[PDB]
Design a protein around this motif. Structure first.
Motif, short mmCIF file in Angstrom:
data_model
loop_
_atom_site.label_atom_id
_atom_site.label_comp_id
_atom_site.label_asym_id
_atom_site.label_seq_id
_atom_site.Cartn_x
_atom_site.Cartn_y
_atom_site.Cartn_z
N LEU G 75 0.84 -1.19 0.00
CA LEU G 75 0.00 0.00 0.00
C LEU G 75 0.88 1.24 0.00
N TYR G 76 0.53 2.21 -0.85
CA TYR G 76 1.23 3.49 -0.91
C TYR G 76 0.32 4.59 -0.38
N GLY G 77 0.90 5.53 0.37
CA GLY G 77 0.16 6.67 0.85
C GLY G 77 0.42 7.00 2.31
N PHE G 78 0.90 6.02 3.07
CA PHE G 78 1.10 6.20 4.51
C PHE G 78 2.57 6.05 4.88
N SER H 25 -0.04 17.49 -5.41
CA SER H 25 -0.51 17.67 -4.05
C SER H 25 0.39 16.92 -3.06
N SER H 26 0.11 17.12 -1.77
CA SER H 26 0.90 16.47 -0.73
C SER H 26 0.68 14.96 -0.70
N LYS H 27 -0.57 14.51 -0.86
CA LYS H 27 -0.84 13.08 -0.91
C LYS H 27 -0.10 12.42 -2.07
N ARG I 64 -2.99 20.00 -11.14
CA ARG I 64 -2.31 19.49 -9.95
C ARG I 64 -2.52 17.98 -9.91
N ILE I 65 -1.42 17.22 -9.98
CA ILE I 65 -1.48 15.76 -9.94
C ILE I 65 -2.13 15.31 -8.64
N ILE I 66 -3.09 14.40 -8.74
CA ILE I 66 -3.78 13.87 -7.57
C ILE I 66 -3.68 12.35 -7.57
N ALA I 90 -3.34 4.54 -2.47
CA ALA I 90 -4.41 5.04 -1.61
C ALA I 90 -5.16 6.17 -2.30
N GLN I 91 -6.48 6.15 -2.18
CA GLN I 91 -7.34 7.17 -2.78
C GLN I 91 -7.15 7.24 -4.29
N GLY I 92 -6.82 6.11 -4.91
CA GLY I 92 -6.59 6.07 -6.34
C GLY I 92 -7.81 5.66 -7.14
N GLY I 93 -8.72 4.92 -6.50
CA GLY I 93 -9.90 4.47 -7.21
C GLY I 93 -9.58 3.32 -8.16
#
Lengths: 81, 187, 48, 95, 96, 108, 80, 94, 105
Positions: G75-78, H25-27, I64-66, I90-93
């Motif tokens: 997992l990526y993000g944390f 963004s930061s994420k 802005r890259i998300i 994460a939060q990628g869908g």
DNA sequence: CCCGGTGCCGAGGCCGCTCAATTGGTCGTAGACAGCTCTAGCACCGCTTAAACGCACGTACGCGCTGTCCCCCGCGTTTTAACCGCCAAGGGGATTACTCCCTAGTCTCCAGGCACGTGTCACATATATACATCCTG
DNA sequence: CAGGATGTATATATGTGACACGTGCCTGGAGACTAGGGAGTAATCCCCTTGGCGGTTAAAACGCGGGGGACAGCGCGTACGTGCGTTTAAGCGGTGCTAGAGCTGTCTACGACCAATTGAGCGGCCTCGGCACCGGG
């Protein structure tokens, strides 16, 4: 060499399926199995030749095949000394 | 202004079964082929070769995907085969060749008892003003094998040229050996 | 059975007496090192 | 014999032995074919070739074991190409 | 000029004979057994190294190896291996 | 010196603690290794080996064979619940498979 | 406690929508609950095993990432 | 406070090089940092394994090249190898 | 005076990569060119992913890259997909795709 | 779904300090390279024959269709709690003090790893009747 | 409700492959014995990030109704299995040849290592603008 994928005949594929539990086999299953075996051997032997060339060796040892299978996830015992 | 010449040989070999087969009535085996004249790897620029046979076969349109391109088959009569060579670059027009499948020997060749029948012809694929990719592929062709590469037809003449060496060496060796062994045992 | 025993006991004995006189040297060293540890305790009082 | 009895016999026979099911001489030529596309004049050890054949046979046995269930899922006794295709897709080889 | 290669066959056969006096083992089975030993050694050592790197420690210890075994071995095999290792580490430090 | 005692004998193990420590210390695993790590590793490996060997010998006696062959290893692994999970992604040469015929493909 | 029912029918249905399903059976929710419970139990066991060795009273996203990497679900993000 | 560290600056510089106007963004930045760290870990582990196989006590540019070959799929491998070789050649000339 | 990154023409921290390699227990001797090569490969992959995500976010009227568009790029690129197959952003869908069988008509 | 307005907090740019990267300098050691060799991989050819290929035939399995019965699906209203802010304090982390554990080096020594020959010691291959184990009547 | 008619076990045997067992070698290991290093354990203690209080609406849930989808029955067709005959190249093991993996021996550039210097990176802070939110088309 060429067209050596045809060295995997219908009796051989049917024995491989019998060992897997299949009772009845279709016609195109043999072509599908040949194509899948060829794709698998392609990656395995590419990893083996990558381990070989890097070693400046002219012979593909069994440890190279073992390491290739480990990379691909197919850890194989019986050939590691 | 760039012209690339690739020498190739396309033909067919045939072997007579000695008798007409009862299963299908065929009398000869034959292999139809394209191979390079030079010891080079055709696969660097050939995508596939399609061979179109006579309509007597269950499928007349056969395909091959690696050099030396060839198909082995059985038959009893002669017919024209259309060989369509496709190149890797889709912008290049494929080459078309017509090969007269020869299975029967001439009277002169039949009298000589030759075990095989062969008909093959030499040609040169000419790429005029080819694309950059096609030019690179044709120029980057590697050697096919470390061994020798050779031609067969006139099969009777090549077989005689082979035997003119083979039987000479064999007879020399035989006579010399017999003489050596007999002299040594007499002493 | 006994021949190798004496040969073994000899190497063991010269090894045993060896390490004995050895810790003897470390002990005497430990006495000088004991005075050095007392000096370190003095330095620790200094630090406190 | 009824279609299926001699097939279940072979199933029970080949799920009992451990010998190689693919012929050596034909499989070594395929291995050398696939190696030619990576290196010209490449040598192979007998042990390496045997390990390759063992890996291939095990992978194919697992693939056919999954294909059997994929076929049974559709109330079918014969394995069809879409069965091996679904097996590969859910395994992640041709997703 | 000898090219001697090492293996675990001398101890894999000792354990085999002590846990089964009458049963032997073939050479191919011994090779597969040594391969299994090497594979699990690599697994456990790599897991201990990962634990050390995560804890920011340059040395692997018995505690790292214990947590690595707990992570690797499943269910009722983890507990057995851990009890064996603990008992061995206590019988080794007691100078017996 | 005193009679040298090996670490394997001192602990009560059969696997080579010295060689395990050598591998651990010269390998990618860490800079330096403690004395307790290789003992624990060798003990765990020895336990796994004893377990799988017991299972293989049981399979061999079931098949009426005195020599453990890769069949007796594959059968043992794929019959045991936890060893199967441990070696799920591991293939054994000349080991074969289980006679697991689906109930739907049987005579009716 | 037995608060496994927190993963309710609408949540499982939205998960199915995201997975691309347009019709769910009547017995899918009790199976998805058990599958998610096993997956959690495993990941949380690995996380707690990491935390015990770390000697930390708080389970961390870093431990969760390590557990996911061990289970193969990177997992990526944390922070990992 | 401590000093958690990341490649954020270099990721932002490469982002400016590829898209001068498209931010991040930061994420997304954290996800990119995690990806870079994971790829670094994998490549370094593969290089160490290659070194252990070849009995070499050192991880060299050739080991890194072979590790990248053993991991990147095809065209990606061929491009990353070219990039690495060009970078090392330009470094050796200074 | 001169950072090895600028010396080799790279943006990534060759020095930090060398430090991490020699401190990560990967080997006892890090070659002079090993960290340069690794930093170059990392920079190449980062540039690829950043460009793809940038033009995936700019394709949706954004600047802005998300994580959504990062995931879109990673799953649309066949190479990056094989690379990060078992990875989850994460939060990628997920990718918009409805099976023809489920679709009407 | 697209478009114009407002709005806010998170992105991105500046400040400043420090600790890692860099520059300079040394030792040595793993490696690069050439020398030698001997195993094993390669090529080939013939006697044997088991497996493969081709074809015939029909039987049972895929597959297409139809019909019932219901079990989910969409929509309305009703009930629960997830969610968004404050307030202690319980822990996660800085800071300092200090010791058990490991490192490093050097001899001394038990132990295992083969080269070789010898003596046992499985079970593969072969043989046969006993047992199912069918399938056509 | 049988019985030729196959196929599948079951048991026994033997002799050639292979475990099994000395016989001495030694060289790479394994441990013992001093000396030196060092990082993490332990005890405080300052400081954020949890866990705990009361409301607000938004989503979960309960019900309803009928509708389209699952599952079972059935039949048509064809293809996939099995057997027989012809064909082919696979297995065997016997011989010949040399290519290079491997051992080995020598000489050497590269990197760990240690010390001093410098600026790249990073925490921190603030200003600001890209997109969250929203109500009409």
């Amino acid at each position: 060499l060429r067209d050596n994928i045809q060295g995997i005949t219908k009796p051989a594929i049917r024995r491989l399926a019998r060992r897997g539990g299949v009772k009845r086999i279709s016609g195109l299953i043999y072509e599908e199995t040949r194509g899948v075996l060829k794709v698998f051997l392609e990656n395995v032997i590419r990893d083996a030749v990558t381990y070989t060339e890097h070693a400046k060796r002219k012979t593909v040892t069994a440890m190279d095949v073992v390491y290739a299978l480990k990379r691909q996830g197919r850890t194989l015992y019986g050939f590691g000394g | 202004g760039v012209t690339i010449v690739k020498p190739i040989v396309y033909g067919n070999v045939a072997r007579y079964f000695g008798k007409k087969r009862e299963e299908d009535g065929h009398t000869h085996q034959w292999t139809v082929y394209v191979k390079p004249y030079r010891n080079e790897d055709m696969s660097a620029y050939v995508k596939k070769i399609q061979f179109k046979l006579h309509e007597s076969y269950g499928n007349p349109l056969r395909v091959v995907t690696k050099p030396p391109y060839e198909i082995t088959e059985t038959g009893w009569g002669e017919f024209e085969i259309i060989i369509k060579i496709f190149f890797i670059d889709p912008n290049e027009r494929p080459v078309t060749l017509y090969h007269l499948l020869k299975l029967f020997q001439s009277d002169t060749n039949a009298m000589l008892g030759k075990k095989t029948v062969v008909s093959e012809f030499y040609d040169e694929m000419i790429f005029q003003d080819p694309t950059a990719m096609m030019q690179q592929l044709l120029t980057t062709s590697r050697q096919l094998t470390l061994g020798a590469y050779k031609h067969e037809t006139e099969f009777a003449e090549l077989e005689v040229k082979t035997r003119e060496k083979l039987e000479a060496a064999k007879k020399k060796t035989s006579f010399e050996i017999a003489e050596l062994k007999e002299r040594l045992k007499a002493s | 059975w006994l021949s190798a025993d004496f040969a073994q006991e000899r190497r063991w004995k010269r090894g045993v007496a060896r390490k004995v006189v050895r810790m003897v040297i470390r002990h005497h060293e430990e006495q000088r090192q004991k005075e050095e540890r007392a000096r370190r305790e003095e330095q620790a009082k200094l630090r406190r | 014999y009824r279609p299926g009895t001699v097939a279940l016999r072979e199933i029970r026979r080949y799920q009992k032995s451990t010998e190689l099911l693919i012929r050596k001489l034909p499989f070594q030529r395929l291995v050398r074919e696939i190696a030619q596309d990576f290196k010209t004049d490449l040598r192979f050890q007998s042990s390496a070739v045997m390990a390759l054949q063992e890996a291939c046979e095990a992978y194919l046995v697992g693939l056919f074991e999954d294909t059997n269930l994929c076929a049974i899922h559709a109330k079918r006794v014969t394995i069809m190409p879409k069965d091996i295709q679904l097996a590969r897709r859910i395994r992640g080889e041709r997703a | 000029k000898r090219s001697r290669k090492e293996s675990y066959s001398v101890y894999v056969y000792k354990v085999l004979k002590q846990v089964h006096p009458d049963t032997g083992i073939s050479s191919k089975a011994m090779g597969i057994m040594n391969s299994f030993v090497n594979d699990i050694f690599e697994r456990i050592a790599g897991e201990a190294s990962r634990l050390a790197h995560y804890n920011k420690r340059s040395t692997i210890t018995s505690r790292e190896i214990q947590t690595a075994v707990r992570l690797l071995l499943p269910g009722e095999l983890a507990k057995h291996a851990v009890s064996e290792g603990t008992k061995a580490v206590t019988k080794y430090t007691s100078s017996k | 010196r005193a009679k040298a005692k090996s670490r394997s004998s001192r602990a009560g193990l059969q696997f080579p603690v010295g060689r395990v420590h050598r591998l651990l210390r010269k390998g990618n695993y860490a800079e330096r290794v403690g004395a307790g790590a290789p003992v624990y590793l060798a003990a765990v490996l020895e336990y796994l080996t004893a377990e799988i060997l017991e299972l293989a010998g049981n399979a061999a006696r079931d098949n009426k064979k005195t020599r453990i062959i890769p069949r007796h290893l594959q059968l043992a692994i794929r019959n045991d619940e936890e060893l199967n999970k441990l070696l799920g992604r591991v293939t054994i040469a000349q080991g074969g498979v289980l006679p697991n015929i689906q109930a739907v493909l049987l005579p009716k």
